[PDB]
Ligand SMILES: *C/C(=C\CCCC=O)CCC=O
């Protein structure tokens with residue numbers, strides 16, 4: 001369940017969480033949910049209780065409006081500076097720099 | 112060893128070795144299955160729709176439905192039929208009584224259909240389109256290319272068609288395909304050059320030039336010297352007379368049959384004449400040619416020696432090509 | 441008998457590989473490795489006579505160099521700036537390159553192979569490099585996918601504008617393997633690299649007949665890829681196929697396929713299952729190259745008394761269709777020959793004017809699409825031409841007694857092929 005549809009359904013009503021798998025199998029996710037029909041919910045996703053369909057479907061429709069250049073490069077000896085290299089990258093990536101690392105393993109493709 | 116079997120590891124490993132692409136993940140899988148002792152399955156050829164009854168039996172065994180191999184052979188299901196099996200056929204004809212078993216079958220099939228290489232049957236790469244909507248959709252490729260839909264036609268299909276014709280069963284899925292389809296409504300005697308040459312000597316250079324020039328946006332024609340019929344090959348010269356540019360491949364002695372060809376019957380001789388006649392842009396390409404006396408040629412073609420030619424070099428092929436193009440009009 | 445000799449070989453060859461391993465330690469500047477290379481290359485060339493002497497002794501000698509042999513040392517020898525001897529290593533590597541070595545060098549050698557591929561000008565080198573690439577391409581989906589993208593294809597294509605039999609033969613075989621073994625993706629890339637138009641030189645050279653056949657097998661397989669069909673068609677090289685298959689004789693090239701050393705295009709159940717696609721295509725340029733080759737094997741394999749291959753490969757029924765609904769003389773001559781060479785009776789072509797067919801012609805076609813189980817019911821209900829073209833599922837089920845839905849389905853599929861070939865002029 002990539003979209004935590006479980007928790008969404010679970011917010012409508014804890015008893016709804018049971019329909020998770022049936023919905024993630026028809027492939028619906030949170031973004032698609034705004035488009036499903038009563039019929040789909042019934043046949044495809046196997047929600048059987050009309051009352052339940054209707055509530056899911058409704059809350060779905062309220063989800064219609066409620067859905068070569070890195071910054072830095074680190075060059076270093078893989079044998080000695082490998083440690084510092086990674087460490088910096090991490091730190092800088094946290095701080096909003098896209099970094100690149102001297103992956104020294106490759107010789108092909110016009111030197 | 113009984114651990115792995117019960118943990119549900121063996122069948123999982125088999126799949127990593129059946130529908131594999133990566134070398135490593137597959138090496139490892141092979142090793143593991145051997146280490147457990149269980150036979151290692153050979154990978155599946157992915158081009159399903161061109162599979163014979165033999166390959167269907169192999170996959171039936173690697174997804175363990177061997178109970179059924181016999182019925183599949185007796186009804187000689189092959190590649191095409193496999194990809195098109197319905198629940199009914201599976202139940203009745205192939206004799207899979209259990210709904211739950213049908214369901215596990217189809218689940219295995221859908222994995223196949225998704226790994227399939229559909230190149231032989233899909234001219235419009237509908238596979239990749241469907242696969243962009245959602246990787247799980249790629250499984251409908253064959254069903255759509257069989258109703259003949261292609262990318263250009265897709266904008267016109269109905270929900271009903273998708274359901275019945277192409278056998279997409281899940282409404283939800285139909286609806287998404289159909290929608291993205293509708294967004295695809297708005298998102299759906301004279302060659303330039305002729306090369307005349309001796310098929311025995313200049314055949315090499317001829318082709319080479321054509322290729323190079325075709326890359327560079329000239330439509331070329333070649334001296335396919337094999338034909339004598341149809342009013343002394345008048346069709347041959349319709350091409351030359353129409354060919355704005357005329358490349359002559361001058362190999363060492365390319366003008367042998369042209370030499371004193373008074374009947375104008377040698378195709379090379381003929382062409383030279385007709386090009387000269389039409390006042391065509393003649394570019395001789397010099398690759399070992401020693402220039403003869405014009406008098407040894409018929410008068411109608413003597414003047415072809417009076418066109419400035421280009422030295423051929425295989426070594427700096429591209430450079431030579433650019434100069435030749437420069438000389439073309 | 442064979443093993444005794446293989447063992448005998450290894451008893452000399454392995455210490456000879458060690459005699460080489462001593463030399464393998466140094467460089468070829470002073471021909472320290474140079475002699476050693478010249479030795480072991482020719483030693484495995486003397487042992488390359490053994491696959492012929494026996495049947496594919498290649499494995500034995502190769503495994504020696506692989507498992508513990510200086511296989512990796514030869515890969516490093518390529519890297520070694522002893523260009524004079526790096527071609528000698530390449531020559532040797534090209535030789536010692538069975539499936540075993542191929543997989544191993546796919547892990548390591550691959551990188552160095554391509555690093556050495558970027559070297560172009562040295563012709564002798566290039567020959568051996570295009571050589572290793574040719575074997576490499578025929579390894580795995582991902583191995584192609586690699587080489588193609590990495591300029592391995594771009595190497596063989598830049599060497600396709602050269603003038604050297606072996607170089608050219610190799611390039612042709614490569615683009616062959618690359619088209620065959622590689623995926624959809626690989627193929628698209630080739631055609632978009634202008635590979636179809638680059639096979640033209642090879643296919644247009646009366647000088648070399650085998651080069652042509654190889655060159656055309658390649659372009660033919662590309663045209664089976666419906667998605668790239670048109671681009672191959674407009675290349676011009678696709679028209680150039682059919683004449684060629686007429687010229688040569690399958691028998692003649694069958695002899696030349698005995699001694700393919702399973703390095704070029706050796707006889708095997710693999711190749712057969714990869715030709716059947718062609719025999720089964722739309723393009724008749726493919727169905728020609730298809731039949732030609734499958735006929736060359738229909739010779740050898742019957743001589744080896746192993747016909748059972750074709751039957752199982754699904755080749756026989758495919759061939760029958762090429763001889764039933766045929767138009768072209770060549771593609772049909774070839775088909776007839778092949779079926780005779782396998783011994784299986786050759787079907788007479790079908791008269792295409794279906795709707796004027798009598799009950800007799802319906803029985804004949806029922807037999808050539810193998811539904812003989814049903815011939816009797818078709819005669820008892822005296823189905824003729826008109827009725828055949830109009831059969832419904834219901835009639836087929838009930839009246840003609842085809843119980844199985846799946847069988848009905850295969851029937852109709854065969855019928856639709858008929859209806860499409862039909863001459864409907866009378867009606
Ligand atoms: C060893 C086998 C496949 C792995 C491919 C390695 C590619 O790099 C095939 C044998 C299957 O049992």
Ligand SMILES: *C/C(=C\CCCC=O)CCC=O
Nearest residue numbers: 769772773776786787788789
């Ligand atoms: C030899 C047969 C057909 C080929 C036609 C040649 C045309 O050029 C017929 C015999 C069938 O078995």
